[PDB]
Design a protein around this nucleic acid. Structure first.
Lengths: 218, 351, 88
RNA sequence: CUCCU
RNA sequence: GCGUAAAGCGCACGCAGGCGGUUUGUUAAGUCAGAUGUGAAAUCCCCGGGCUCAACCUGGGAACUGCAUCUGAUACUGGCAAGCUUGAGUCUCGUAGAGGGGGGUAGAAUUCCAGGUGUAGCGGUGAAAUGCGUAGAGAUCUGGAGGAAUACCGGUGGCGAAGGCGGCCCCCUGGACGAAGACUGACGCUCAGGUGCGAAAGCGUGGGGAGCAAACAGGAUUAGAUACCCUGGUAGUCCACGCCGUAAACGAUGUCGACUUGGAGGUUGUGCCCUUGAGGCGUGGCUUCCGGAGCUAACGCGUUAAGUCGACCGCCUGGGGAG
């Protein structure tokens, strides 16, 4: 069922041929993802999310997409979980040993600039240290309270954040993504064939995941 | 089950390809981007300029429904072609009703012919028609109160290329492009054409039933080379253009766009070019032989170092006037060819 | 080039009927009539190598068919080369 | 030199 | 092992040789199993024995990878008989094409010759000079002759085994492709030797000779300049008939066959449907690019493989000497 959001199918001709199990060529030369097979895979994903979030595990939500930017922050801060939505830094997970002290720069700098020397040196120094905070803030803000390696990675576009998937396949993190028709379902453990570029879809999938997380925490 | 299959053919049945079914609800507004959701893959990046009506301000808040268009899918990410064209179909339907009605009555107000037929504008849009269509007889709306109210009675329409000439006043009265390419030909027939894509040397305005026009970069404005056509006109907009050239072989109608503010320059040469009119103008860059006042709508290079005072050679204008200041300067010569007005500053009261 | 009346004449003359057109005696007879026709074309013109390669092609085609027919049925092989006239 | 999507 | 490291014949046809679709029956040659005879002894190997141990000697066996005969097994291979149609081939319609040979003809241009008008330069270069011109050049116009190549169309288009083949028309002629059927019934693939074709240059005989152009002359350039540059200019380039038989003859990739994710194009047929609109969905052939797994030393190749395999052939074994 196309329940409330429209997650029917995608692009036109540059489909990844590994996703031959999910195709219907429409009259407008556009693929239709098999919506009667999408739902068992999505329920097989949520049955994993209740388990590893009732583990008290940490989900990391990833999607930039220029349109699913705010749906991740809004639809992930409703839980107790963590998000990366603006820019995916190369090596935030497998080079987290040196991303760590950049997080220490962010937390240890808003600690200095909420009350401390945010005016005590120079107007230009406030224009530097503040611009540093708005540069790191929408780069590490959702991952700031994590303080560890995540137990899962919820990717909204495999084709757009394919280096986050390979990133968390160097190490042993079970990633799972909603893939498009042109995406590659290889590193993704629990593939969800659907719509990556609809605001309705990144409300729907991410919202039901958000229900399985906070409803799953017992 | 087959619930989904039936569901799919149902949803096929309850949408169509063009901008026909008014379905996209406006779900976020921000200047300068509207966005809908007509049951397609993504959400349109709508301009604001497909949705403000006839005086410049927006008309539709959240929840409002206009259909857009289709048949083009995925340029990378996104979905549509604009809903404003949608509107064109509605206009066509009303015109068809008039033709269908046997006639169409609205209001048509046509002041003048860019290319031989008064221009008629219906609601937001303005269309161009062949010269006869504006008047039923030889009445001519030049003597009528300007931009007068009638309707439009149709005289002529071209049926493929969209040109419609309509009938103001007189209420009582009631292969294919290229063989006969002599209709808009003769030297300078002005046209109303939507631009399509600006290829950094060009603009590609092309409307008249399956042709291609360029208006490349040289005219476009009254500056030659530094212009970059994306800055100066638009994307997707119906403009002032006329032919200037049709080549029978090679199929390159080479239109133009300078046939406009050229007139403003001519007026400047005249308007203030009648004799020796005085002008209050601001200098912009003094280049060691002058001062280059360039006020009054793009009139280029002006006052020479020779006048400037009542001493000839020694003066060096940076010492004597200013940078960026409005001065006395009067015209003294407008040269019609080679685009040189030559103002002066010695016409003052010292001797 | 070996017109349709000539081909129907040779099929009907060497075969069972006007339908048995692909049997071995028929194919050998059409290749032989073609070769003996083209001997007049290579009597003059002397330099048409691109056509003489087609001639040598159907010569070898005729020889492999005759080798098959000699291998299968020597009776019709002698009746065909004596009815047709070849072997040096 | 200016005929693309 | 053979695209680039050494190495795929320039390309084909083709005898001997090698290899061979599928079903049934027979044979038992290959093949398998057993048995018998033989495969000398010594030697190797195993388990023992004797020299005080070992080397050494020696008992018994195993082995002597084999050959012959008899008896069977008949799955595969082969022989024989009878088939079958998918491989291969033939016929009826068309389709496109610089495929080949011969003949003819058209227009533009270059050169020359005759004539007219006209006079002081032309030509050339990075600059110049050699050169041509007052004996009338260069330019311009009219006419004529002769030879050669075919602008535009011209398309990482087409055809051909390769070399290669572009105006237009005729005659003779080869191949490919597809649709629907019919027909033959494994007639097939490859091929050492052999035979054939084979750009350009060149050679022989006879013609022809516009333009270009090795050799050659001259002017420059340069320290020199047997060169690049310029002015000329003979073989040759062209045709007919013979020869030569080589090329970076290149996709640096032998031929044939099967299988194995995609995309964008080109060209050429064809089927259905609303040709109702340059429309949509399939289907064959040839071809161009990009990329997937896989492969590779990498570069890259990638359904037209350099991926996975099979049949046959050619070739390679450090560099120079040396093709």
């Amino acid at each position: 069922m196309l329940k409330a959001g429209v997650h029917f199918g995608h692009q036109t001709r540059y489909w990844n041929p590994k996703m031959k199990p999910f195709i219907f060529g429409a009259r407008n030369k556009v693929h239709i993802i098999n919506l009667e097979k999408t739902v068992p895979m999505f329920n097989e994903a949520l049955a994993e999310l209740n388990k590893i979030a009732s583990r008290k595990g940490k989900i990391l939500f990833v999607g930039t997409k220029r349109a699913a930017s705010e749906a991740v922050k809004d639809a992930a801060l409703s839980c107790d979980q963590f998000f990366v939505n603006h820019r995916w830094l190369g090596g935030m997970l497998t080079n987290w040993k040196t991303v760590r002290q950049s997080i220490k720069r962010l937390k240890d700098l808003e600690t200095q600039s909420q009350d401390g020397t945010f005016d005590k040196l120079t107007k230009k120094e406030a224009l530097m240290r503040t611009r540093e905070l708005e540069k790191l803030e929408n780069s590490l803000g959702g991952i700031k309270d994590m303080g560890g390696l995540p137990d899962a990675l919820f990717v909204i576009d495999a084709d757009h954040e394919h280096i986050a998937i390979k990133e968390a396949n160097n190490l042993g993190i079970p990633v799972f993504a909603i893939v498009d028709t042109n995406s590659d379902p290889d590193g993704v453990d629990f593939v969800i064939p659907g719509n990556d570029d609809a605001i309705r879809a990144v409300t729907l999938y991410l919202g039901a995941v958000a229900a399985t997380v906070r409803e799953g925490r017992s | 089950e087959s619930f989904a299959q039936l569901f799919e053919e149902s949803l096929k049945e309850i949408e169509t390809r063009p901008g026909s079914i008014v379905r996209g609800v406006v779900v976020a507004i921000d200047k300068d981007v509207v966005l809908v959701d007509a049951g397609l893959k993504s959400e349109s990046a709508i301009p604001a300029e497909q949705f403000k009506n006839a005086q410049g301000e927006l008309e539709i808040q959240v929840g409002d429904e206009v259909d857009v268009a289709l048949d083009a899918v995925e340029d990378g990410f996104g979905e549509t072609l604009l809903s404003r064209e949608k509107a064109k179909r509605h206009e066509a339907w009303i015109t068809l009703e008039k033709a269908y009605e046997d006639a169409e009555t609205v209001t048509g107000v046509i002041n003048g012919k860019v290319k031989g037929g008064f221009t008629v504008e219906l609601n937001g849009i303005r269309a161009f028609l062949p010269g006869s269509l504006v008047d039923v007889r030889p009445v001519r709306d030049t003597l009528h109160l300007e931009g007068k109210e009638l309707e439009f009675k149709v005289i002529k329409l071209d049926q493929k290329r969209n040109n419609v000439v309509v009938s103001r006043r007189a209420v009582i009265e009631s292969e294919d492009p290229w063989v006969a390419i002599a209709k808009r030909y003769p030297e300078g027939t002005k046209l109303t054409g939507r631009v399509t894509n600006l290829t950094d040397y060009g603009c590609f305005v092309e409307i008249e039933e399956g042709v291609e026009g360029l208006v490349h970069v040289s005219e476009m404005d009254w500056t030659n080379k530094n212009i970059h056509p994306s800055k100066v006109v638009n994307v997707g907009d119906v403009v002032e253009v006329m032919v200037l050239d049709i080549d029978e072989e090679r199929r390159r109608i080479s239109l133009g766009l300078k046939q406009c503010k050229a007139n403003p320059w001519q007026q400047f040469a005249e308007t203030h070019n009648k004799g020796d009119r005085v002008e209050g103008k601001i200098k912009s860059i003094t280049d060691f032989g002058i001062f280059i006042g360039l006020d009054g709508g793009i009139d280029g290079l002006v006052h020479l170092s020779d006048i400037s005072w009542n001493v000839a050679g020694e003066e060096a204008v940076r010492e004597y006037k200013k940078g960026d200041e409005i001065a006395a300067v009067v015209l003294q010569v407008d040269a019609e060819r080679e685009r040189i007005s030559l103002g002066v500053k010695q016409l003052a009261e010292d001797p | 080039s070996l017109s349709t009346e000539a081909t129907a004449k040779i099929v009907s003359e060497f075969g069972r009927d006007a339908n048995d057109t692909g049997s071995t005696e028929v194919q050998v007879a059409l290749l032989t009539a073609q070769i003996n026709h083209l001997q007049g074309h290579f009597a003059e013109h002397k330099k048409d190598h691109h056509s003489r390669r087609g001639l040598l092609r159907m010569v070898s085609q005729r020889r492999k068919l005759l080798d098959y027919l000699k291998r299968k049925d020597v009776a019709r092989y002698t009746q065909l080369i004596e009815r047709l006239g070849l072997r040096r």
